[PDB]
Design a protein around this ligand. Structure first.
Ligand SMILES: N[C@@H](CC(=O)N1CCN(C(c2ccc(F)cc2)c2ccc(F)cc2)CC1)C(=O)N1Cc2ccccc2C1
Ligand SMILES: N[C@@H](CC(=O)N1CCN(C(c2ccc(F)cc2)c2ccc(F)cc2)CC1)C(=O)N1Cc2ccccc2C1
Lengths: 808, 805
């Protein structure tokens, strides 16, 4: 007997093992100042209790985290956020209490942020003066009833700010205390589907747009001072309703949600302007709804989702990213303000203001990305003033790179009075030039809050990328004038998450590795101004510094001739010759890479606990995995739960050969979300390989998941019958084991993303087919698991399931 | 040692095939009809419901001079909707009756015209029965109404007419002409909180009332026809969301569910009148309300338990209950007391002044208790002959055991000024109150048990436990002379009987522990001058019939109270061996599991447990039914606290008497109240019960309804000790830290005991760091209807005991 057996602990024993195991700066703002301190870094951070507004003093060495707010409890009673704010917190996966974000205006020193019920503000820097003690944070009153969501200061005038209240755009004035509503879409459950300024469910969940309104950066002076706001109008009437249990479990009630199924209708959408004029006293004189001369649905037919939007820096154009329903055709459009006429009741009136719109004014479709895989929504779009602009683009080569583009704004001339339906490419601009600023078998980061910082003086664009290796994020500088020598600025051996000064003199880097915890360091760009590309990142100061054996990154190749990366958590105190029981950790879906060179000890602590007890833990980024360019991701197209398991097994057999200690007779597939889907999919296809499976929040019916995600990867149901049925674990329950203790199902009862239905439908089908199952519900938890108590029970149940049942 | 019996360990495949091997409705709802032919071969025709598939309308012939043929009334016909799926109001009415049988569950019948009316298919149907021989096509009744037509009833005064609820309003129609008139206007969910003719949730779930209107038996001469009905308003009653059966649709349904301590609905009695002419057309209609408001006349009344009319049509009647369910009264309501309802207070006051001073509410009977009022069906008004009112009434409160009393109350007209509003706080004098039955036993009056009163012979036939609590028997006693009670059904068996209107025959659905049921038709024969002593002679039979019956036993407790039990022996027992034991439990009020009737249909899984060598013990402890109010009252305000002692007491007695109980391997298990006591067993007696498999448990009494919880446990404001003491969710710290000791089973669609109870239990288990196993039933409410689920339920149960006991 050369097989290693784990110590079988009692339940109190396992509880103490988990309890024993469990016993950073972000959102930076560089403001320059002559005393000892050159800059001030404002930021959000959580010291050794809750997240809050902090600052450090950059001198001329570890920086102190100075408190900016005075004895301020930003989090509510216990931590009970409002119904909308906690869903806003689930969409961003914000699992920290306190001030999650803040708006800032660098000229005035105005900070604006949510906390408890109301909004708050405090003034610091510039014309007010720098505090050297915690400031009293001032409340802003309202006579709006409910919560005030999505605060943003007016860029053109710091006296004004905006917010959503009851699904409508509001505008207020900090100084005078005045409020004014601008949209009137919302008056009710089904009875009020109308909404303005909001990003609807799918847009938040699947497209990562959490706002639906955009201030104009500049103010015009017609004929008073006018301030415009671009905003998405939304109409969720024909979108199917679904009921999900309230966290008020004692109430025994649910919430209506406009949840689009794959195939079913997405909300009807439009962009609208909201103007308003002000005087010297700062009072709102007049307000106006404006809409597009022709309807949004006819100017841009076959457009389903507004991915992104904003303005140009001059305010001469609003813009948006448009997507088609299959998400294979993206467009960038300029919408000039003169194309918007005041929304009016009368047929006689609506043509008068239409006639008044110039023939020269039109929508100019600047850029258009096309593919056979799918469009990923890349954030990067920097228009220069006058059209020249920087854009990220993956479709062209198959890898996300920066291009510089010049578009020709030639006015064809249009009869805006008489009703107009366009041809195929009616608005496409001539692309004058398109320069490849970056190129290669690697990617520029443009999603999940990655961004470029463009310095106009030097003609350099700063960006993050995988140029050295997929395992590491790094900061790179390149010229957009001359696409030439890219210079790496972050030191190798680590993965960096950086943020730049607006002056381009300092920068912060939050960085880590597999073997080392995270650090947050401030680096000064030094070197003469003769050649600005090649300024050395001089280490200036440190914000943060620094049982557990870390895992080892490794790599292998397939019979199809391609690199897949993996990770191994080595069994603690390993004897060569002994073979250990193996927990294969899984996710395997798109938008995720688990195998990279960064510290895993915080989020994936349980994997090291597993390791501490004797388990081999293996992670494999198979085809579909993120960071490897479009074709690598595209391997899943209309075949989810098919390609993934075969390279999960390939990575496990490889691990058996490279390392000495795997027992392939005792392997356990486990993952949450997509991982749970794959766990269930592993036990269907490879029961010979996987003795047990712990599947958590799986999708069992693809039909029951939404438009945005599903249709991007698996097409519409009517177009992909085979793939929907092949990849839906609930329709293949006949192929789950007849042996009990081989499948443990986990699901959150409040899960608003992947609904409990999937499990409820899997069990329904398991019972029908006559199949044993174990199940664990989390009654107070949604897609993730926030409450510690719940988390501990999960981990204790995990160790007990593997202990008793992953055997022989 | 080798004394411990170890059950054969089977694979999950093995268990499924054992369970599959296990599984491999009787006549009811009788109607006697005399043939009216002196020279013909048949004396009677029995009409009834039954199976071969679907529960369809059948009939048998009773010859004058032996199995009877089950003749079908309908021409093939399909009563069940395709794939066996009913609408909302049909399915949630079947759950309240626990109707788990396909097809026609009930019919109305009119014995003058031979007119049958029944809710079949997704509509209404009718047929007439000269007397047919071969089947007939039942005619579908047309309608322009949108939704389901619920609660169909023939108008007793005129078989041309009938009624139904439609969108929670009362409608009247005519099977001859086809004309349809709506009578009430309460409705157009949440937005529509009013309703008329409808029995609300708690009225159905906890009070055994399903109809909310009552035809007047006579018509007064055009001719007019009255209908009594409960007008109801659920605005102030809390709303809760329960998952629809359309799981694929992922929507809940809103119920009006009054949790304990919350408001019940505002209620009232109202009349609905409509005149007709010689050609059958409805001429006019009229809403009518009580001349004084309902809440001022009969204050402190919370639930309308039962209602109807006297046979003459003179007085309507109702049984009223107070919120703590300790005070019941039977009120007479003459039609005179109700006036045309109008918004014009001057037009209404013209009607108010018009109602005479003599007309009045007469509170006839009244029942006071310090335990609780159980709602009993039996109330028979005799016809008023020779200002006063004689009637028969069942009454548990007087002695503590339910017995028939003949009562005469004085209806002395007081005199009231109905025009000017007043507020009292009607009590009739009782002229006499004779006990017709007495003793330490009981007359059956809940759950559709009834008397049959023959006025020609002055006798009252009834169902009771006079001989033994283990058997229901048919008795006859005179109501003139409270004398000799003669038994008509033979001992050894429990019986479910039903009488002829001419009192010459009866059917008896009867059975025993040892023997499967039979439905036998008997004839009452003997001299007519001595009617009490008719010998019941066997006339004919309509039905006859791996199993091993249990044996009933009794033991006494430390307090000297006699508790009955059942035990299933392990099959092919070897004296010496000590077997692992499954204590099957219910333990709540309103149920008796231990009696002398067949168990093998409903409780086959207990024999299946026995077939694999498990001991199965069942004990009816204090709080259980059929033994009078004292015995039930042992629970009052102490649920979860008394029950397990008797259960453990019966379990120790069982290990003594029978030599085969290994007390080291006892598993407690039950559904509903049973699963609650299973959890309470694992908390209070963990040394005694190694595992608990608890199904559909109430884990927070504070979350269960008004009707049930308040009756036994009081309002939470008055009993915070007992609520907390008996809520298993608050005592989770005391549950085991060892895994494999607690399996939780619950129906996801449960609209009675909500899945919340399980949900909230797991929450508290997770907080305490306690292990559990769980199984959901996605397409199941409180009971497990679907075969596949039940099989899965049984395979889990066996595997769980096998692995972990
Ligand atoms: N719409 C997607 C979204 C998705 O697939 N993702 C996982 C979450 N993820 C963020 C994250 C949040 C919280 C946390 F703890 C970790 C990651 C993230 C990732 C990288 C990063 F830098 C910052 C945040 C983004 C990608 C979905 O909900 N499902 C769940 C699910 C379940 C079954 C089948 C398909 C899908 C598809
Ligand atoms: N309101 C009570 C009502 C009750 O206690 N009863 C159950 C229904 N029962 C009928 C029945 C039908 C079919 C079947 F399969 C089982 C029972 C029955 C029994 C005998 C008979 F002749 C005719 C019908 C009558 C009594 C309740 O449900 N809970 C559920 C529950 C669960 C936990 C705690 C308290 C309670 C309170």
């Amino acid at each position: 007997a050369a097989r290693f057996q784990v110590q079988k602990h009692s339940w109190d024993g396992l509880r103490s093992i988990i309890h024993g195991s469990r016993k950073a700066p972000h959102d930076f703002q560089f403001v320059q100042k002559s005393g000892p301190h050159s800059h001030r870094l404002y930021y959000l951070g959580m010291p050794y209790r809750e997240n809050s507004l902090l600052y450090s003093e950059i001198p001329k060495l570890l920086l102190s985290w100075k408190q900016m707010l005075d004895h301020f409890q930003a989090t509510p009673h216990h931590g009970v956020y409002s119904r909308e704010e906690e869903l806003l917190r689930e969409r961003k996966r914000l699992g920290v209490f306190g001030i999650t974000s803040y708006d800032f205006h660098s000229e005035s020193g105005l900070f604006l942020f949510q906390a408890s019920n109301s909004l708050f503000h405090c003034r610091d820097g510039g014309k007010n003066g720098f505090m050297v003690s915690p400031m009293k944070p001032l409340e802003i009153k309202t006579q709006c009833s409910g919560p005030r969501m999505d605060p943003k200061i007016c860029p053109a005038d710091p006296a004004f700010f905006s917010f959503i209240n009851n699904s409508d755009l509001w505008v207020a004035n900090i100084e005078t205390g005045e409020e004014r509503r601008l949209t009137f879409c919302h008056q009710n459950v089904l009875d009020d589907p109308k909404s303005a300024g909001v990003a609807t469910f799918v847009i938040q969940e699947e497209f990562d747009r959490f706002t639906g309104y955009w201030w104009c950066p500049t103010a015009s002076w017609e004929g008073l001072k006018t301030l415009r706001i671009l905003y998405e109008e939304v109409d969720e009437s024909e979108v199917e309703v679904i009921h999900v249990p309230s966290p008020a479990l004692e109430e025994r009630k649910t919430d209506s949600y406009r949840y689009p199924r794959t195939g079913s209708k997405n909300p009807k959408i439009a962009l609208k302007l909201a103007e308003f004029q002000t005087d010297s006293q700062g009072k709102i004189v007049s307000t106006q709804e404006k809409e597009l001369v022709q309807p949004f649905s006819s100017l841009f037919p076959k457009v389903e989702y507004i991915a992104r939007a904003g303005w140009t820096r001059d305010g001469k154009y609003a813009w948006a990213m448009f997507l088609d329903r299959p998400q294979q055709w993206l467009q960038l459009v300029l919408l000039p303000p003169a194309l918007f006429i005041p929304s009016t009741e009368n047929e006689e009136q609506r043509l008068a203001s239409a006639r008044a719109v110039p023939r020269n004014v039109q929508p100019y479709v600047v850029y258009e990305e096309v593919t056979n895989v799918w469009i990923n929504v890349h954030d990067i779009f920097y228009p220069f003033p006058q059209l020249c602009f920087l854009r990220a683009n993956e479709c062209k080569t198959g890898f996300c790179h920066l291009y510089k583009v010049t578009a020709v704004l030639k006015s064809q001339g249009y009869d805006w009075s008489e009703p107009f339906s366009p041809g195929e490419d009616e608005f496409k601009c001539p692309i004058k030039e398109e320069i490849a600023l970056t190129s290669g078998e690697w990617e520029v980061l443009a999603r999940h809050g990655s961004k470029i910082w463009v310095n106009e003086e030097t003609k350099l664009v700063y960006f993050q990328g995988t140029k050295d290796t997929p395992l590491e994020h790094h900061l790179y500088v390149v010229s957009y004038e001359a696409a030439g020598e890219i210079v790496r600025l972050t030191t190798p051996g680590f993965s960096h998450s950086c943020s730049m000064s607006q002056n381009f003199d300092m920068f912060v880097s939050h960085y880590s590795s597999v073997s080392t915890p995270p650090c947050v360091h401030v680096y000064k760009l030094s070197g003469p101004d003769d050649d600005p590309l090649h300024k050395q990142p001089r280490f200036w100061a440190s914000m943060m510094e620094a049982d557990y054996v870390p895992p080892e990154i490794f790599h292998f190749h397939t019979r199809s001739d391609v690199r897949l990366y993996g990770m191994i958590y080595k069994p603690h105190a390993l004897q060569p010759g002994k073979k250990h029981p193996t927990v294969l950790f899984v996710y395997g879906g798109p938008q995720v890479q688990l195998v990279n060179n960064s510290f895993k000890g915080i989020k994936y602590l349980r994997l090291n606990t597993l390791a501490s007890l004797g388990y081999a833990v293996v992670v494999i980024d198979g085809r579909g995995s993120c960071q490897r360019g479009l074709r690598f991701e595209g391997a899943l197209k209309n075949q989810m739960g098919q390609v993934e398991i075969e390279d999960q097994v390939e990575g496990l057999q490889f691990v058996a050969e490279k390392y000495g200690f795997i027992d392939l007779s005792r392997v356990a597939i486990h993952g949450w979300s997509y991982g749970g889907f794959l766990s269930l999919m592993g036990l269907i296809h490879k029961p010979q390989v996987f003795k047990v499976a712990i599947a958590g929040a799986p999708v069992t019916v693809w039909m029951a998941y939404d438009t945005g995600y599903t249709e991007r990867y698996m097409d519409v149901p009517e177009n992909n019958q085979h793939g929907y049925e092949a990849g839906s674990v609930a329709l293949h329950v006949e192929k789950l084991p007849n042996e009990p203790n081989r499948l443990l199902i986990l699901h959150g009862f409040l899960d608003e993303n992947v609904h409990f239905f999937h499990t409820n439908f899997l069990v329904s089908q398991l019972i029908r087919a006559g199949k044993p199952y174990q199940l664990q519900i989390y009654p107070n938890e949604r897609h993730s698991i926030r409450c510690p108590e719940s988390g501990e029970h999960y981990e204790v149940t995990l160790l007990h399931f593997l202990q008793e049942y992953l055997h022989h």
